[PDB]
Amino acid sequence: EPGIEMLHGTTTLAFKFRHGVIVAADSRATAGAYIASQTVKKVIEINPYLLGTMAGGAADCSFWERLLARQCRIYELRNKERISVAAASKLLANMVYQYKGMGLSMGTMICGWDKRGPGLYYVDSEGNRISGATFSVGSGSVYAYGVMDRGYSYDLEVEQAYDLARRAIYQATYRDAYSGGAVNLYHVREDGWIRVSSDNVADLHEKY
Amino acid sequence: MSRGSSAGFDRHITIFSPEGRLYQVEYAFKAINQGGLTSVAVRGKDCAVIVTQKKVPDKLLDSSTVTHLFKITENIGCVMTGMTADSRSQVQRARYEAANWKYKYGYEIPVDMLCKRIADISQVYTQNAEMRPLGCCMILIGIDEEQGPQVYKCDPAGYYCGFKATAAGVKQTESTSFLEKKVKKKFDWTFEQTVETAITCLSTVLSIDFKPSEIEVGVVTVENPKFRILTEAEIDAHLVALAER
Amino acid sequence: YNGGAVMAMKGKNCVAIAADRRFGIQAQMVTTDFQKIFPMGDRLYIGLAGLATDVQTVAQRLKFRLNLYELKEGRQIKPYTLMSMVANLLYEKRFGPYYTEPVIAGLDPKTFKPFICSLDLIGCPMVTDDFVVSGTCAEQMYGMCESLWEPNMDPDHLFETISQAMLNAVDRDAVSGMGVIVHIIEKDKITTRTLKARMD
Amino acid sequence: RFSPYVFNGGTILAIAGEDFAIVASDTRLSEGFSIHTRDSPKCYKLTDKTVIGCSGFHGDCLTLTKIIEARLKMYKHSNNKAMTTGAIAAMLSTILYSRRFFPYYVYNIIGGLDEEGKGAVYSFDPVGSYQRDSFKAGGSASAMLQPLLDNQVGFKNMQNVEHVPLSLDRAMRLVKDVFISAAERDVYTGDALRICIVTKEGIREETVSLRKD
Amino acid sequence: MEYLIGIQGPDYVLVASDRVAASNIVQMKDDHDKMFKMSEKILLLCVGEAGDTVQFAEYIQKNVQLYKMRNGYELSPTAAANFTRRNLADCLRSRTPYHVNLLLAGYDEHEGPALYYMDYLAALAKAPFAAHGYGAFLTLSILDRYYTPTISRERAVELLRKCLEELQKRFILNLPTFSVRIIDKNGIHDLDNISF
Amino acid sequence: RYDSRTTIFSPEGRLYQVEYAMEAIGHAGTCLGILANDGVLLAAERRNIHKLLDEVFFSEKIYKLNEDMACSVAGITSDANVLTNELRLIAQRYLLQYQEPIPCEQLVTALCDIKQAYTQFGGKRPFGVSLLYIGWDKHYGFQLYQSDPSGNYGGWKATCIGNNSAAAVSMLKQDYKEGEMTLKSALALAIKVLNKTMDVSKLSAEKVEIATLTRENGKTVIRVLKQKEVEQLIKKHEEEEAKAE
Amino acid sequence: TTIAGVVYKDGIVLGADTRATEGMVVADKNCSKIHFISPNIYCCGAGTAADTDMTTQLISSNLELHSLSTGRLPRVVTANRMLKQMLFRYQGYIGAALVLGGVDVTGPHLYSIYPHGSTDKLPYVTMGSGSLAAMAVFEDKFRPDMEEEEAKNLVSEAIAAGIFNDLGSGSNIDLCVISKNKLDFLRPYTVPNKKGTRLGRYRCEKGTTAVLTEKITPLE
Amino acid sequence: GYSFSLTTFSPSGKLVQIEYALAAVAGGAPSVGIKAANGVVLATEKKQKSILYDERSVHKVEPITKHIGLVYSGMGPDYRVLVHRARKLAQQYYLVYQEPIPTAQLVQRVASVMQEYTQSGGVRPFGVSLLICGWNEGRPYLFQSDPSGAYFAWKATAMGKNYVNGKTFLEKRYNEDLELEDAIHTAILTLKESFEGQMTEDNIEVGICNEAGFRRLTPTEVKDYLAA
Amino acid sequence: SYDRAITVFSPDGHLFQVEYAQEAVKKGSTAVGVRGRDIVVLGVEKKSVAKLQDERTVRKICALDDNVCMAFAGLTADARIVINRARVECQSHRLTVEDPVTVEYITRYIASLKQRYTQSNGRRPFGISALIVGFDFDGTPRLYQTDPSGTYHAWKANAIGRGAKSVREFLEKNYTDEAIETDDLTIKLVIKALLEVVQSGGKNIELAVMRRDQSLKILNPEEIEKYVAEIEKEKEENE
Asked: Residue C59: closest CA among chain F residues belongs to which residue?
């Protein structure tokens, strides 16, 4: 690799049950066959209003979402009130729509609880920008979708939602050779996301 | 945006008078006579010759470096009258101009066409707001293909014409009068009873007999069409021939 | 690609022109009422064939430019003038070539003189006294004209001959066909007729 | 045709301690199958507290380090203060990403202290996605180096052993030994060793000899 | 891919779209609307390369709304159709990925309903009925056989249901739900989606 | 405090330069249009007193724009030529973009926007021309619009520009009706208008422009009236004031 | 297409065919006649016919205005240089092929312009598809200083050989004679091929074809 | 003041600068253009003050196409530029449209190009008016270009010095009934009426435009007509 | 000062172009607005009667968007350019930050454009002031009034243009909660306010209201002649 592959995406997670959105992701940069790191946080604290997600390409995701953070704080200053989730998704999609077909490999999900309540949008490299109730992207996204689809319930209680996220992330990393590391849980409760925990798959296996 | 033209009829060229006469053009015309030099251009059936003073009011100067006959092409040359700097520039301009002509059409530019293009360049100055007209008049000589020699003179106004014989400078009215008198009656002008008559013109109109150090003469001949300049090794002999009559 | 064909033949102060109606995406018909012949004057028409996008682009742009010309000169355009006009429009977009081969049929606004002409896709007129074709099925259509033509044709026979030519030809082309429209420009009136073509 | 990139080889290692941040790199600079020089260090001092280590395409290494020096001077002038190590890392991220469409073929590790007085090591990718780390190796032999560092510094896969913090002397011994071990399987490692020890009282340099083959 | 379809009655136009988007094999949103609200009586159906479709559609959205507010009156469906055709054809020579296949439908008080087929080559074409996407291949025949130029809304809906059932019988992709709207003298009317 | 260069305000905020522009309008040929229930008719005055003039072809102040509209002009005539060329250009470009004829309001707006923009950044003189617009669209039927160098504009059932224009409209508004203004009655009363506002010279068929806008058979038709009907109308006029006593 | 030219005693006698070949199908039996621009500088060309034509128009215009400015008749070398430099910079692009001939004050001249801008002053050149055969005819039968009728004949067989011995060429033979005094419209000089008599007598019968809709539009 | 700018109208909305250009045109050389049922003739005065001048190195009436002739009354260089670049415009028109420009669209071109100079500021208006002779579908056209950008078509007109008396002289001496050959003679009569300087052969340049296209008259032909 | 650098500071600092355009709106036709409890009225006179006009074209009242209208005073063409530019920006926001824009945001955009016609020797200052009014995202009434300076203040209710002051100090003398409780009285205050300045009666005063969340409804010359309906309210109950 001449320095540019950066990822291909590993096992994200997000859904929006009736107590806000929770998100989950692992931490395993897969430089080809060799792990770059076991401790790459993939949930991105854009602000105490809104959370991103790294997947598909490390550098592109990080850079463009940091630029988004700049832009949205500028918005919050100029308009004096916080930007909505949909508006942030629009901004990211418009920003990434240019540089179409130049090698971008973003797979972010914008998550937040704005004035319309829960907010969840899928924004990627090639321009898809869709809301929804259930999402996950990356190599292990398929396994994640399996477990998630069989766990999801809009009325699910909070702690059971945590259990669902942990189970899904763990199974996906258990099957994928490219997903791994320590699991991260972030709950976006009422205003201000709250970090849940950063537990390790090895211990999860004992717990399971 | 730019500093702009000073508000006034004569203040700037662009404004027309009540009769739409361009003052700054007249100012250029009577700016030509600065430097005191007056030049004369006459042509015969075989040659076209242009003659002017060589004022050297300092012998710290080198006679070689001071001049007004500037070769433009090996076939076409010119003379300058007016201030020195604008003459510098238009000589450069016409050299470039004719070179571009030959490059882009494959044959030597005709005298009339070069004069026309230079006249166009001079004219476009009288169109703009921070152009200043190039206060100098430039005269051509050359042999085209069949018309033998031609003499052409543009001006700051952009007006030009072909002259059987012409002049420019301070004593220009008197030069033109003597030119008319000579041209009406004697008109063969092979090579010696030829333009040497214009040397007689210049002497009579200006001063006593000249000795060649003050005179600068360049010629082109139909049978030998190089733009080439005679010296006191040459001009002297001519003028001793003229002195005797 | 999309397919189609156009044709025009001259005659005794009467010119004929025709084009098919199939609009299909490279294998599959979309509809049978697609416009390829366009009126450029009282007695002047242009027929297009090629990429449908370039057809509907050149037609609109020619409408634009010709209307500007009409308003400027204040006079109905000469056929040769339009010919040279379109000869340019394709050429400015030289390295963007508009994938179309226009044809022209018209008469003299002062004499009603018969006139037709065609263009290459970048503009190289074939000012022909007899006929031109364009599109995909050019060769079959040439073949039909090369025999079916005759000098000094009265308008009814001209219409019958163009009808027979195009119906024989487009029947033999897969991508073109499915309906044939015909216009007859005579000294006074215009007849536009539709033909019972194999709709397969 | 013309290949704009070339692999000059080299290995860069960093370890973060409590009062120190060792940076580690050899000086075997090669191209193709030939040793250019034995004494080209791959660790550069930036400030009294921050030391960078770069590996890979050496031309990119030079250009990057010189532009980093320029930006350091710029920041000093503009804000009347030494640029913080974390600021250094963020600036390196953005400047590396500025060549997103023509990547600097360079792997980078930053050795330095925080302004809380503790050690901190930032690792990078050739495009600029960085992350704070307790330890990192970059370059060709980083593959050989990393598992052992995981085993000792991270105490990974150990059992029933006290996780004593890594002291300065132990870290020094460990880095010497790991490069000695690397020298015998990798081809791009050896001929020398440069070690920078960044402390609270300045920067002192250390160097030893390795296998010169 | 996806699938769009338009049927024009004597006095109305009926549209229908599938409601699934894909990434590789997955269907992230099962409740996805691919169909946009140009103005009070004009509906736009879009499909094509991911990313480009929504951008171009909303570009036209802002254009037409700006037109309405600049003029007060309403843009005719034929006019918006030609406008989209131009804004699409021009970008063909300077936007390599710009795949948007369109079915612009709407009603005009003067000329009744009008449905427009629109290949990504921006080759506009009137149609009594049309469709995009792969399923158009399997379905256009059925839509042809049971079509008459005059069809009340009831038979139109039933023919559309026949079309969709044929898809679910034969088409290899999974399209379980379809959104249906109808345009008539009284604006657009939402119709219950076709679930199975 | 001082006026120059079309971008500076006086201490009342109104542009001197444009107000001067609306003075040649007071000197230009009188031009007026009348909106009828089922047509539009437009009048203007020829300054063409010279019998050596010819080639009256197709108009002399009635410039035709699109498939269905035409305009009329008063002011600096070459300025008008530029304005009309530009108008035709955007009209045809709107048709290109939409495949629909330009609605009259849109065209007038798009033109007066440029006219206003020349009362903005720059410094070059504004258009010294006031324009009248007659046309039709499916939205609103027959419409009549006036244009102003300031960019101001308005729809009028009846308006006049030119010399005596204030007097002309003063009589018109005490004469014009709400919607029984048929084409022929509107012609007759327009001719009465032009008679009364016209200067001392007796009114002639050889000084009026009469051009009309009509519809039949789904087509919008604009004619420039030939002479013969012009004497018909004017002699009709002189005899129905043979009633007036 | 097969075009050739020679410099006989007092001018140039250009030759050209009139078979336009769109692909392997005859575009025109009487291809747009290959002679061109303003007097005493007629040229003929081949290659990408469209660009030959429109280049000739461009240079014709640009040179005619030049001459009008001069008041003197234009020179061959002038057009030669113009064609040089324009068929230049659009190098690696379409360009064209040209045979430029004319008789100015310097007498006759004949240059052979090439796509990238290769030109050369020759007594005889041949361009097009059958240029090879035409050159063969010339090199067989060319002697310097031919007479007018002799040159006309020579070009006649030169073009004829290309006509009968090439696939992309052959139609009416076209001759273009330019002299210091005179100029000929030999359009066309000689035609070897005549269309065979149509033995069929089809005489398309009325009512042959059914008609769906008959819409009539009186105009006058 | 209010008379220095070209960019501000007078307090009377009345362009002083254009009027000054008009006066300059009036101060030019006499010129005459006569339309006739079979052609149009243009005549004007050569004012080579000294016999040292050559008439015919330069020229006063300039051809533009086969069938276009231009003549002016004002300052020469402006006329020469306008001829040189109206040639550009016409050459365009033939390039785009394979048929020589009709005279009308040429005078459209020229009127536009001078008017834009009037409305630019910093550039003086083209202090010269133009005359156009043309022949379209075989019928004569005659245009006068006003430096204000205005263009007028005349049966016959005269400009330059004393042009008001020239126009009056034309009024009572011209008819639509005329032909070209006598039109030449009557135009010469018009110039003689206001010549101030005793016509020789060598004072007028004459140009005509018929079906055979525009072309000058050689001095031989000027003598040849003046014989009777 | 004279021509160059068209926006030059005054010897004390009185930037001449600013108040020079300020004076432009005292010959501007008088406009006014009121921010009511649930309705907003936007009244303006047209005392240039020219009764042979089409009132449709010569409205003062333009609507910016689904949620915004405005009126102005001064150089009409400049105001039209402002309106078109503001409409474009509003559409761009509704595309990019998709939501009905708040009145304050569009007002701030207007002010930014208005004040950015102060740089760039070039561009001259605009000669209009606006009354931006509309219902927000929440349904609260809003009002904003600007001046060529660039300031974009908000008012309970304000008037601009010819004789704007007298209307203003009539307004606070009558603006009260027991004047806005009813929409009819809400508009009646505006009626009386321009009655103080109108050409002697309900003559050519064009106005429209925007009740919450429906549209801009043109208060029209109804059979009752909506205008003179309220007019006669004051005629025969002002005693």
From this structure: F96
State the best of F25, F124, F165 to mutate against chain H, taking most chain H CBs within 10 Å: F124
* Domain region containing E95: 1-196
CB proximity under 8 Å: I 110-169 to F: 120, 122-125, 127
The CATH number of residue B74's host domain is 3.60.20.10
Residue written as token pair 């047509």: F39
Contact exists between G and D (3 or more beta carbon pairs < 8 Å): no
- Do residues C149 and C163 touch, judged by C-beta distance below 8 A? no
A101 interface with E at CB cutoff 8 Å: yes
CATH no. for residue G83? 3.60.20.10
Residue A33 among known ligand-binding residues: no
CATH number for E38: 3.60.20.10
Tokens of B49: 């010759």
- CATH code of the domain occupying D1-213: 3.60.20.10
Question: Is A1 a domain residue?
Answer: no
Of A93, A127, A130, the CB nearest to E32: A130
How was this entry determined?
cryo-EM
Secondary structure (H, E, C), chain C: CCCCEEEEECCCCCEEEEEECCEEECCEEEECCCCCEEEEECCEEEECCECHHHHHHHHHHHHHHHHHHHHHHCCCCCHHHHHHHHHHHHHHCCCCCCCECCEEEECCCCCCCCEEEECCCCCCCECCCCEEEEECCHHHHHHHHHHHCCCCCCHHHHHHHHHHHHHHHHCCCCCCCCCEEEEEECCCEEEEEEECCCCC
What is the tally of structural domains in chain I?
1
Structural domains of chain B, count: 1
Domain of residue G64, residue span: 2-190
Is residue A49 within 8 A of residue A192, CB to CB? The reply is: yes
Q: At what resolution in Å was this solved?
A: 3.8
Radius of gyration of chain F (CA): 18
- Domain containing residue I54: 1-239
Question: Count of domains in chain A?
Answer: 1
Please give the Cα distance from B242 to B240 (Å, whole number): 5
What whole-number distance in Å separates Cα of residue H17 and Cα of residue H9?
9
Query: How many CB atoms are located within 10 Å of the residue A32 CB?
Result: 8
E63 in reach of chain F (CB within 8 A)? no
Q: What are the chain A neighbours of D123 within 8 Å (beta carbons)?
A: 37
Tell whether F96 lies on the interface with E, counting CB pairs under 8 A: yes
- CB C73 to CB H97 under 8 A? no
Q: What are phi and psi of D25, to 5 degrees?
A: -160, 145
Annotated active-site residue A11? The verdict is no
Bridge-partner residues for D75, per DSSP?
A: none
D94 touches chain A (CB under 8 A): yes
Residue D73's alpha-carbon distances to D77, D83, D94, in angstroms, are 6, 9, 17
Q: Which of these, G126, G177, G138, G158, lies nearest to G12 by C-alpha position?
A: G177
Domains of chain C by start residue, with CATH: 1-200 (3.60.20.10)
Chains in touch with I (≥3 Cβ pairs < 8 A): A, E, F
CA angle B116, B120, B126 (to 5 degrees): 145
List, comma-separated, the residues after which chain H is broken, a break being a C to N distance over 2.5 A; otherwise answer none.
none
| Cβ-Cβ contacts under 8 Å, I98 against chain A | 86-87, 90
C134 to chain E, minimum CA–CA distance in Å? 19
Amino acid in position E53: T
Q: What is the CATH number of domain F1-245?
A: 3.60.20.10
Answer yes or no: are the C-beta atoms of D203 and D197 closer than 8 Å: yes
Q: Does E83 touch chain F (CB under 8 A)?
A: yes
Parent domain of B103: 2-245
> What residues in C contact E126, CB-CB < 8 Å?
31, 33
Residue G52 lies in a domain: yes
I58 touches chain F (CB under 8 A): yes
Size of interface B-H (CB pairs under 8 A): 100
